Design a protein around this motif. Structure first.
Motif, PDB file in Angstrom:
ATOM      1  N   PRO B   1      28.413  29.747  41.222  1.00 24.84           N
ATOM      2  CA  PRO B   1      28.828  30.227  40.130  1.00 24.84           C
ATOM      3  C   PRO B   1      29.721  30.757  38.789  1.00 24.84           C
ATOM      4  CG  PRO B   1      27.235  30.841  41.173  1.00 24.84           C
ATOM      5  CD  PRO B   1      28.212  29.705  42.155  1.00 24.84           C
ATOM      6  N   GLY B   2      30.216  30.573  37.984  1.00 25.72           N
ATOM      7  CA  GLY B   2      31.063  31.287  36.980  1.00 25.72           C
ATOM      8  C   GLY B   2      32.631  30.738  37.353  1.00 25.72           C
ATOM      9  N   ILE B  10      34.416  34.328  31.589  1.00 22.41           N
ATOM     10  CA  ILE B  10      34.127  34.191  30.342  1.00 22.41           C
ATOM     11  C   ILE B  10      33.850  35.916  30.537  1.00 22.41           C
ATOM     12  CG2 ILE B  10      31.974  33.337  30.810  1.00 22.41           C
ATOM     13  CD1 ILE B  10      33.368  33.476  27.074  1.00 22.41           C
ATOM     14  N   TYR B  11      33.438  36.156  31.467  1.00 24.71           N
ATOM     15  CA  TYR B  11      32.374  37.215  32.161  1.00 24.71           C
ATOM     16  C   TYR B  11      33.710  38.472  32.051  1.00 24.71           C
ATOM     17  CZ  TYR B  11      32.590  36.586  37.030  1.00 24.71           C
ATOM     18  OH  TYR B  11      33.419  36.493  38.284  1.00 24.71           O
ATOM     19  N   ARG B  12      35.125  37.940  33.025  1.00 28.72           N
ATOM     20  CA  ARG B  12      36.027  39.451  32.596  1.00 28.72           C
ATOM     21  C   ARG B  12      36.743  39.000  31.489  1.00 28.72           C
ATOM     22  NH1 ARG B  12      38.602  38.589  38.475  1.00 28.72           N
ATOM     23  NH2 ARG B  12      39.796  40.264  37.801  1.00 28.72           N
ATOM     24  N   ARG B  13      37.018  38.463  30.763  1.00 30.70           N
ATOM     25  CA  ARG B  13      37.785  38.285  29.809  1.00 30.70           C
ATOM     26  C   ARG B  13      36.860  38.858  28.218  1.00 30.70           C
ATOM     27  NH1 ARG B  13      36.734  32.623  29.700  1.00 30.70           N
ATOM     28  NH2 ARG B  13      35.702  32.194  28.298  1.00 30.70           N
ATOM     29  N   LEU B  14      35.929  39.218  28.677  1.00 34.61           N
ATOM     30  CA  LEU B  14      35.249  40.255  27.923  1.00 34.61           C
ATOM     31  C   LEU B  14      35.018  41.796  27.834  1.00 34.61           C
ATOM     32  CD1 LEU B  14      32.497  37.322  26.459  1.00 34.61           C
ATOM     33  CD2 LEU B  14      34.543  38.521  24.878  1.00 34.61           C
ATOM     34  N   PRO B  15      34.890  42.397  27.088  1.00 31.91           N
ATOM     35  CA  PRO B  15      35.381  44.241  27.270  1.00 31.91           C
ATOM     36  C   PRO B  15      33.770  44.403  28.249  1.00 31.91           C
ATOM     37  CG  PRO B  15      35.579  44.192  25.665  1.00 31.91           C
ATOM     38  CD  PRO B  15      35.387  43.014  25.260  1.00 31.91           C
ATOM     39  N   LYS B  16      33.575  45.475  28.572  1.00 30.38           N
ATOM     40  CA  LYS B  16      32.440  45.946  29.079  1.00 30.38           C
ATOM     41  C   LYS B  16      32.303  47.214  28.566  1.00 30.38           C
ATOM     42  CE  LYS B  16      33.622  48.217  32.710  1.00 30.38           C
ATOM     43  NZ  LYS B  16      33.229  49.039  34.105  1.00 30.38           N
ATOM     44  N   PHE B  17      30.358  47.124  27.729  1.00 29.37           N
ATOM     45  CA  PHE B  17      30.100  48.001  26.332  1.00 29.37           C
ATOM     46  C   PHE B  17      28.448  48.229  27.515  1.00 29.37           C
ATOM     47  CE2 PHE B  17      27.800  45.379  24.413  1.00 29.37           C
ATOM     48  CZ  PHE B  17      27.736  43.552  25.910  1.00 29.37           C
TER      49      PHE B  17
END
Lengths: 77, 96, 48, 63
Positions: B1-2, B10-17
């Motif tokens: 999944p993913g 998607i979960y790796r092309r967005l920054p952590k915050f």
RNA sequence: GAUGCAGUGUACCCGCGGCUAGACGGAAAGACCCCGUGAACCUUUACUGCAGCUUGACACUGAACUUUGAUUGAGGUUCUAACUCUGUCCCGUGAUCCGGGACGAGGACCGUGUCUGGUGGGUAGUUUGACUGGGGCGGUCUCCUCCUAAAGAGUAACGGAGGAGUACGAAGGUGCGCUCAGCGUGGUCGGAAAUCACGCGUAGAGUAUAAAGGCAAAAGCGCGCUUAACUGCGAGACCCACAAGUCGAGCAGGUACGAAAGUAGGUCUUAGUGAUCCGGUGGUUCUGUAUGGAAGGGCCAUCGCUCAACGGAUAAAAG
RNA sequence: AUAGCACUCUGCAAACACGAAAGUGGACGUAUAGGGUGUGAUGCCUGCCCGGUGCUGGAAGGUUAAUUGAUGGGGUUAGCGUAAGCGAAGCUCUUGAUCGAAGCCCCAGUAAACGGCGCCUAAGGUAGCGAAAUUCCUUGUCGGG
RNA sequence: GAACCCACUGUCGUUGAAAAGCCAGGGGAUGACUUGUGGAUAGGGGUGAAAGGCUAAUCAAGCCUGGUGAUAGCUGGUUCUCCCCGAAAGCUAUUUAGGUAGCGCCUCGGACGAAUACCAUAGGGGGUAGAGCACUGUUUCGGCACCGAUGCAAACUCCGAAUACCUAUGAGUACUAUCCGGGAGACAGACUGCGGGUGCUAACGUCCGUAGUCAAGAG
RNA sequence: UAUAAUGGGUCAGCGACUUAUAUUCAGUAGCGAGGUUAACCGUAUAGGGGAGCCGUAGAGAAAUCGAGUCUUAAUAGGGCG
């Protein structure tokens, strides 16, 4: 051998969005144009990229006017 | 999944915050309508824990205005919002 | 080639803008008036 | 066995009342060339797209 | 590439001996060719690690007499007690191993343990892109403009034809002002072609750059003052699988120009670019593990190497 | 493979090989012997190149690993002061002065070491042989059969 | 030149007498010779007058057992009955091209109701077919770079349709349109007609747009 | 695909979507602003056991506040409720 051609740019989706007789609200874009194919008249504004938009609620209209024969687009309230 | 076929997910092309707050995991929220579960007119951390409206390991609690109460309660050592305090005084309770 | 440079407020607020400069054509530093939001007033900004 | 969360996704998605929230990319290093409008608008948090909501739920079961 | 389909010709039912033209006859899930982000073995100036070899620091490691350099460590000459002997003798012992004793030849060396620099196909694990009128070789991989494209949008080919990986504190804002280029007549060393005067027709000039669409309130050209190439926003729209991209009236604060109405959130527009992780810098009425601090973390702004196979297998890789 | 030939290493607790070590072969041998490498009875013989790589020797001139730790900066803690907002030891976090061998850089020799033998380089084939186990054009040209 | 040890030529045999042989010829045969018995070297090891040879009919890494039910985006297979609906072979991205993911297309449930479609009427932009030389380029014949006539063009335009597309009002006929959620399959297409690039105005050739059929449909 | 593409000489018997745990949706039943126990005790499907879990309130990175909250100088404007 090999051809030295084979390149082109992505599409831009230029053209008219609202035709004559249609109802528009303030802010609606009416024409997307690379140059000034159409000129803003009453209640129509011009953007940096020559896009024409409505500045008031009303109905769109197209016309030909002026000495140069310039095509104009306006909004009638 | 993913997995999306090789393109960046998607979960790796967005920054952590953000960072997690430790004190939030120990802070508790209590609805005003839940005070009916308390036995007695004393509303405190111990009595709420006894009524099981607050988990034992919690160190502080806050009452917020959600529902309606019909009894007089004397609240000790529990934070109150403006509406919750108004409702308590209207019902006939006191704070401290 | 154009080099990246900063303009720092003269009021000590620490506010700064960023821009580019041609060194060979502008040997000296840059001063310009700009709005500083931390003090809400137009003040001088110096190169850095 | 217990379902396991994907911690990378957990560190990128937080839960709201009716969905999930996130920030926007393109705000890390290359910023001088970008216009002020892009900086201002692309600063902030936005909502997850419905097309990806199902994937986010599969990735983060417990939120 | 038909005993079995269509038309048509021929042919009473069944053995035996012989023959191999066909039954794409039997035999072995084609070895030739391509593919799989398969295997094995081999090579090396492919990547990465180890054995081996080699360098130095500390410990085993001591004593005496002495020399010279920038208190200090670098040497020279002797000695024996640590230590070496696959050297002789005696004993255990009727024993070429081993141990103990005596002597002899060496000796603070050699060699061993930890650390450390170099070397290292000896050995081990791996890697060595895709498209493609088969594969290889060649060419290409991202963005912008025109045609193909069938008068809304969109539309493929290793189809036709060209550009881009920037520049500008003015080449930005505002106030005011001015129109190009080409021809026809006269004049200095200046004439096909320099500068100057008048007249004719007419945008063929110009717009930092490739092309298209545009440009008189000129978007083309000149001068004065200046920094709106601002901060906080943003009704409403375009485009799109997502990630993204684009236009924008209007409100508040501080400005520039103008007598004023007012104009200005960079440049006529469309290319001039790189997600995420990690790391650097400035600010921060956020957090900071007993408490007060600090370190670290978060938020706002920003920067760097690389990902051109340009949605970027692990920022390390051939035959 | 071979007798023969040549280069190179080995001074004996030899070099070299096996093994984790103890130890074992080499050898109960000792440079006229032992190991590695190439060529291959015999006759005539065996040309030029040290530029590159490798090996051997010398040089001590530049570079620096561990180790070592002069300075510099930061955190915490004392004490005066209605009022400035100051800052000591100790403990502790960082920085990297100097010293510190090789390897590398440099010079010279070596080709029966790998290897090379067309205006330019290190130098551009001596003896000998040749459509020849080596010639694409090729059934090269001439003589014999 | 016999014994013994070998294996140079040919015939036969190839479900053989034989998982390497027979027959007729052939080579060495006092030597680096042949042979019995017992022993030593064990797998990334041994041995090798060196063929990648031999190491129990097995060798570019022996055999047995164990990890073990290794992995395989690949090939094959997948078992009783009836009723309703019913696709696709596209776009975007991908060490991606015969895999996968999002959207487009199918099915089921829920919330809604004409807000949808066909046709008529009214408003609206266009730069293709055709045509033309007024810009750009090119072409031929005559008279003084110019003039008159004449012809051509995907990347020329003084002009310019039929269709197609957007909005508004309306009769009639059709349970249409929209939102949320459960379950998928599919991302190798083919021929034909029309408008085209490429090819030779070749191909049951190849690549697009558009309509029908097959795919999944008998008569 | 009649294909001269694959598989089957024939019969009888055997032969392939399961089990455990967690989660999401749908049906059905109890109770309902509440619902419900786990381990464990219990001559034991009873009874006891309330630790714990879900629902009942969001906004913000967070402190924090709370039918509001974040952003901002702004009781402007905007986002999420």
């Amino acid at each position: 051998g090999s051809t030295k051609n084979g390149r082109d740019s992505n599409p831009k989706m230029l053209g008219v969005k609202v035709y004559g007789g249609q109802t528009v609200t303030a802010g609606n874009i009416i024409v997307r144009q690379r140059g000034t194919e159409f000129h803003a008249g009453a209640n129509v504004g011009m953007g940096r990229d020559h896009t024409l938009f409505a500045t008031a609620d009303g109905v769109v209209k197209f016309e030909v006017k002026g000495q140069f024969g310039r095509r104009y687009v306006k909004v009638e309230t | 999944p993913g997995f999306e076929g090789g393109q960046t997910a998607i979960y790796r092309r967005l920054p952590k915050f953000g960072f997690t707050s430790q004190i939030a995991l120990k802070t508790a929220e209590v609805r005003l309508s839940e005070l009916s579960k308390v036995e007695g007119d004393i509303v405190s951390l111990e009595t709420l824990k006894a009524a099981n409206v607050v988990r034992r390991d919690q160190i502080r609690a806050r009452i917020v205005l959600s529902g309606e109460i019909t009894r007089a309660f004397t609240v000790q050592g529990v934070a109150l919002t403006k509406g919750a305090k108004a409702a308590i005084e209207a019902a006939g309770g006191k704070v401290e | 080639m154009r080099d990246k440079i900063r303009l720092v407020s003269s009021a000590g607020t620490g506010y700064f803008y960023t821009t580019t400069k041609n060194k060979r054509t502008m040997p000296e530093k840059m001063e310009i008036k700009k709005f500083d939001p931390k003090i809400r007033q137009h003040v001088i900004f110096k190169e850095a | 066995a217990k379902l396991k969360t994907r911690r990378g996704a957990a560190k990128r998605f937080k839960a709201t009342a009716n969905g999930f929230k996130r920030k926007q990319a393109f705000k890390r290093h290359i910023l001088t060339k970008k216009s002020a409008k892009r900086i201002r608008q692309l600063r902030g948090c936005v909502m997850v797209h419905v097309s990806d909501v199902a994937s986010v739920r599969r990735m983060c079961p417990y939120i």
